[PDB]
Write a protein that binds this DNA or RNA. Sequence first.
RNA 1: GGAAUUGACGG
Length: 547
Amino acid sequence: GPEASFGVLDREELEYFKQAESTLQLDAFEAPEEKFQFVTSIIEEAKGKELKLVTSQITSKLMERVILECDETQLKDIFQSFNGVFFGLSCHKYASHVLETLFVRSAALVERELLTPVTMENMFLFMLNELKPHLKTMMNHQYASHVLRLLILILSSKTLPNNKVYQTPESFKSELRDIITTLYKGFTNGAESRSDISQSTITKFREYSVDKVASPVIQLIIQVEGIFDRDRSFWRLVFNTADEKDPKEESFLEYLLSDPVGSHFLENVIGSARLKYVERLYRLYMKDRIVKLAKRDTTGAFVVRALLEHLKEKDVKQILDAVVPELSMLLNSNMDFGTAIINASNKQGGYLRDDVIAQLIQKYYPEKSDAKNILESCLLLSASTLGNTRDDWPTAEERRRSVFLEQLIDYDDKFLNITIDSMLALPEERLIQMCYHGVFSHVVEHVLQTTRVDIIKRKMLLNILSKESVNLACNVYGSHIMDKLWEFTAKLTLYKERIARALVLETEKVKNSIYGRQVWKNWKLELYVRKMWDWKKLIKEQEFEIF
RNA sequence: GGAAUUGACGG
């Protein structure tokens, strides 16, 4: 990071802040003002050495904790102290992250001053002016380019890191338009007009669009260019506009279709190109190849998903015609292509819906065979973290497969039935385990849909789950299953009495648990004790309401 | 009162 010199803290300064963070995440505060007073206390010892605290791996975390938990005056004080060295920080391994926090808080505060009126608006504008000669540099920089991305979001009232948007004064809008065109001008060696750009500077721009750090910045600009440029200069920098293939564009499109970064870029950008330009790329370069591309799970499949969302009725149907006969084979690796087709089929009024269900079942629960078990097919239950002495935590593919199963259960009743049968085919032993599993407990919970599961299947699930009433009651996850059971147990009151009895026998264990005492409420167990007839009455009112 | 290394780039 030669872009500025910050130096380092000494062991004395290190230990003070190393200790402030300790006692700050300890969160042993006995009031809010006490915790605030401690933050102010930190900001205080931090004055004059802010550039050092923010560029250290030991204390940069601390600084954004501070940026989030501090005053709006103090926030303006911290921002003001980064004056003159914003580019340096922007390009810095640790500081670039703090500038990001700083800027999101700042953006929130800028709205409060817009909707309830040195102001934060002017402060932001100062730093912006300070970065403008460096934007093209920043775009390619492995740290700075994230700050440039964020800035463009804020300036366009798009949504920010860590699902909220913020409104902006007109100057922010004017600044955005200024820096888009500054980049555009600085990407075209001049120039006269669209019609006067060399096929070598078009190639050089295309080259940026598949760069691992420049590409998201170019996606973003294309995403927000439409706000002023009703001609969309940057799109037209990348793709052509005539009804025929161009050998350079074609060679380029094939690379996008086979390259991870270029796949992202094509898919993120189709979601914001004008339909006429997207239909052109489809018909020219993909239409007659749609299955071959669909089979490219890591590159290009994703472009097919984007076509399915942003093309119009007639054409997403053609793609569905091509791809649904292939779906079960495509699910062998790329499960998320399943979601794109389910969603697309629904968007077109259940188009080919029966065939999609046929295919899903063909893959995850093929009628013909034995050992049919959608928990093995779809979650790979046997080769999973489920039930280890090895002290492993649930994985991200586990969470991903679980969510896919759940959406399958939402999709149709056939799948709800299939996984219930699959759960009963398990050894009791193993179904119980899933209830204690951070990720898989959600799958059990998802099955407990009273009006949707016939009373015989309910009763048999209840034969298993009931054995563990108390244990489920006191478990982080099992307690969420036990709550669902209050309703599931409708028209089956023998199982209600049996469960409520079990919980009550072990009352002091059940209460005096964080989770147990909530189950106690949800099952109205206090009524079960004080006023049985009133408890029974609730049961009857439940059965009537649900049936 | 609970789910985490997604197909690209950062502690």
